[PDB]
Structures are given as structure tokens and as C-alpha cells.
């Protein structure tokens, strides 16, 4: 049972050392591992091949700041003085031979961000338009707001950060780090 | 130089079923397999296998034995992937790849295709001016809206004024059965509503474009 065992999500401010691990599973600690880099819509990007002694070898147009390093069956990717350009999911990667069948297997990725500001709402009433239709649909917008995690409060959807959000009632409240 | 080119998004129903291309270019197309990974939205990348390019077998990954099926036309330097009986869960993007062994790492990847599989049928939006509540009195802005409400697939494209706001613009992303999401603008109550604010929504999908004017309520 092959498996790369990832730490799956991590921000991290502006110029601090970032350390991601990758953790083979114990029957393949001695495993040879890749590293890539997704941006949102986009293929994943080589970043470097590391080795269990912790010799790695970095792919084109990958900055110093990057390198990597292992302890038994850890893999670390450290990214010192992080750098806006720098967030991306990191994905580790491990591919193995087993009765002459190459089998392949990536972790679920980390997803890095690089790190205060309250939340704005704009609420709006449903339109005539829609009310002739016997519907109505409250709608709160949430903006300029950091960092992402958001609760809102009021028949209801809303939805993910991307900061600013949106909610729909079919008062607006919002819960930002109080 | 070296490049994958796989073909564009597509939207089936359950049951259906689909083939996507990958056209590699700029090396020797049968000394490299050709490998394929998915991706289901928000989800981690799984291996589906690989072809190899000279004798045309394809070797599938364990979750992907039965409905898959990797094929090529070497001349055409093409690989394909087919899925059969498609379900929901064939929601994904998938990547071919190319893989480099003497240093191991994939090192080449196509742009990735993006395909929806849904019992939905293609719907355009009802487009919904967003007047504010209260007039501004003293405030020096206002802001507006559009609801963008019911439709599918993704995407729509809103624009303010035919492109001619831009900035004050913010088109919020879209939630769930069909799509609903809202755009807003911020422009000077010395602006609006002495000047004309439009609202262009397109959803191409159902080939609709509609304009709203946004009037006081």
C-alpha cells in the first residue's frame, strides 16, 4: 500500500521560512519522491526530485529560496523567505515498479497561500421584476475582507471565499475572526 | 519546441460517453508513453495509468480498470482517453503527461480538459437589476448589482456599461439545482443615477446576452 501523506493546507506571512512535508508510507521510506507546483488553472509545474539522503535536483526556473531535505520517511520542501509568486498547491509524487507494472501515486497536495482587513456588506432587496415572478432572492455581498474564513448567518447558499463571497436568502450577518 | 495540446471542455449526461485528445508536439512521439492524470474539482490528482506509444497497450491504474480505455493514431502524434457510461463522478479535469526516466519526473503536460457530467439541462439566466435600498443622501458612493439567477452550465460573463466601468467592478462567484451568482459596481452618487448603468450579462452556453439598467426603486 503505496501512499504519500500530505499536510494538506498552510498560509504562511510574507518572509517567513515555509517547510512542507511529504511522509511515504513506511514500506517505501527509502523512496525517491517529486515535487510539483499547481497554480489554479493550470497543470502541475516539476519543482525538484528529492532523495531519502536529502540530495535533491530542481527543475528550470525554480528559485534559490527552494530546497529540499529528508529523515526517514519524510520529505520536506522548505521555501525560505516566501514570496507572493510562491503560493500554489505543492503536490509530492512517487512512482514504483512492482511485477514489472510502473505504478504512479501523488499526495493530496498542500495548498500554500501568503498572508487584517473587516469585512464590507452591500445587501440588496429582491427586484420588481422578480417579485411579478412570486420569488425573492436577498442577496449579501461580502468584500474586502482578510483573511478568508467567513461564517454568514441570516433558504440559503453561499458561497466560497475567493477576499470576497456572496450569500442568497431565497438582516445579513457575517462572522470574520469575531 | 515540446508541447501537449488536449482538446476543450465538455458537458455530458450519465450514461454517455466521452473521448479526449492530446496532441503532443515537438519530439518523437512514440519513444515516450503517454500518461493520464484526474482531477475532480477541489480534489487531489489521481494516476490513471499509461500507453505505450510504440506497441499501443495501455496499462490502467487499479481504480481505473473497466470504463477507461487510452488509445492513439501515432502519425497524428495523438493520444486519446475515453470514458464509457459516464456518472457525476467523472466530474473532473484531466491531463495527459509526458514522463522523462534515465532524474524521473513528469515534464511535460497538456493544459488539462475539463469535463461536467450532469442530468442538467442547459438553462439561460433571468437577469435581475439590483437597485439599492435607500436613496444616498450624503454618501460620495453608491453601489449596484445584477442578479444573474438559475442558469447552467457555468459560465456567464457580466460587464458594466459594455466594458466601459471597470473599476468599482466585482463579480462574485456562483453558487447552487442551477447557477446563480451576482455582480456589483461602485461608482460616485454623483454618477448614478444621473448617468445611464447597464449591466451586459452573456451566457454563451444558451447564446443569450442581455442587458439590464439599473433605475432607482
Known amino acids: 500500500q503505496l501512499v504519500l501523506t500530505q499536510s494538506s493546507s498552510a498560509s504562511f506571512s510574507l518572509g517567513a521560512s515555509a517547510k512542507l512535508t511529504c511522509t511515504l508510507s513506511?514500506?517505501?521510506?527509502?523512496?525517491?519522491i517529486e515535487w510539483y507546483q499547481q497554480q489554479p488553472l493550470k497543470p502541475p509545474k516539476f519543482v525538484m526530485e528529492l532523495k531519502k539522503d536529502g540530495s535533491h535536483s530542481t527543475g528550470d526556473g525554480i528559485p534559490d529560496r527552494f530546497s529540499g531535505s529528508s529523515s526517514g520517511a519524510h520529505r520536506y520542501l522548505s521555501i525560505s523567505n516566501i514570496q507572493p509568486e510562491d503560493e500554489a498547491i505543492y503536490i509530492c509524487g512517487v512512482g514504483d515498479t512492482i511485477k514489472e507494472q510502473f505504478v504512479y501515486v501523488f499526495g493530496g497536495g498542500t495548498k500554500v497561500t501568503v498572508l487584517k482587513s473587516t469585512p464590507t456588506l452591500t445587501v440588496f432587496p429582491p427586484s420588481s421584476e422578480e417579485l411579478k415572478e412570486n420569488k425573492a432572492t436577498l442577496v449579501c455581498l461580502i468584500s474586502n475582507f482578510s483573511p478568508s474564513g467567513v461564517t454568514v448567518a441570516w433558504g440559503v447558499d453561499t458561497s466560497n471565499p475567493t477576499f470576497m463571497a456572496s450569500s442568497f436568502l431565497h438582516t445579513c450577518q457575517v462572522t470574520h475572526e469575531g | 519546441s515540446i508541447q501537449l495540446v488536449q482538446s476543450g471542455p465538455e458537458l455530458k449526461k450519465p450514461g454517455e460517453t466521452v473521448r479526449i485528445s492530446c496532441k503532443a508536439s515537438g519530439y518523437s512521439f512514440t519513444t515516450y508513453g503517454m500518461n493520464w492524470v484526474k482531477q475532480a474539482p477541489g480534489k487531489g490528482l489521481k494516476w490513471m495509468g499509461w500507453?505505450?506509444?510504440?506497441?499501443?497497450?495501455?496499462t490502467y491504474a487499479d481504480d481505473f480498470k473497466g470504463r477507461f480505455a487510452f488509445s492513439l493514431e501515432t502519425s497524428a502524434s495523438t493520444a486519446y482517453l475515453q470514458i464509457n457510461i459516464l456518472k457525476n463522478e467523472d466530474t473532473a479535469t484531466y491531463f495527459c503527461a509526458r514522463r522523462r526516466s534515465d532524474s524521473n519526473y513528469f515534464d511535460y503536460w497538456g493544459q488539462g480538459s475539463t469535463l461536467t457530467v450532469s442530468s442538467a439541462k442547459t438553462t439561460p439566466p433571468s437577469v435581475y437589476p439590483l437597485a439599492p435600498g435607500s436613496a444616498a443622501q450624503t454618501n460620495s458612493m453608491v453601489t449596484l448589482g445584477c442578479l444573474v439567477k438559475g442558469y447552467f452550465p457555468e459560465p456567464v460573463t457580466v460587464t458594466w456599461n459594455s466594458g466601459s466601468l471597470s473599476s468599482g467592478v466585482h463579480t462574485f462567484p456562483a453558487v447552487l439545482d442551477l447557477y446563480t451568482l451576482s455582480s456589483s459596481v461602485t461608482v460616485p452618487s454623483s454618477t448614478w443615477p444621473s448617468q445611464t448603468v447597464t449591466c451586459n450579462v452573456a451566457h454563451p452556453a444558451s447564446s443569450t446576452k442581455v442587458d439590464k439598467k439599473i433605475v432607482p426603486r
Open positions: 500507453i505505450n506509444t510504440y506497441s499501443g497497450v495501455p
Open positions: 513506511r514500506q517505501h521510506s527509502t523512496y525517491t
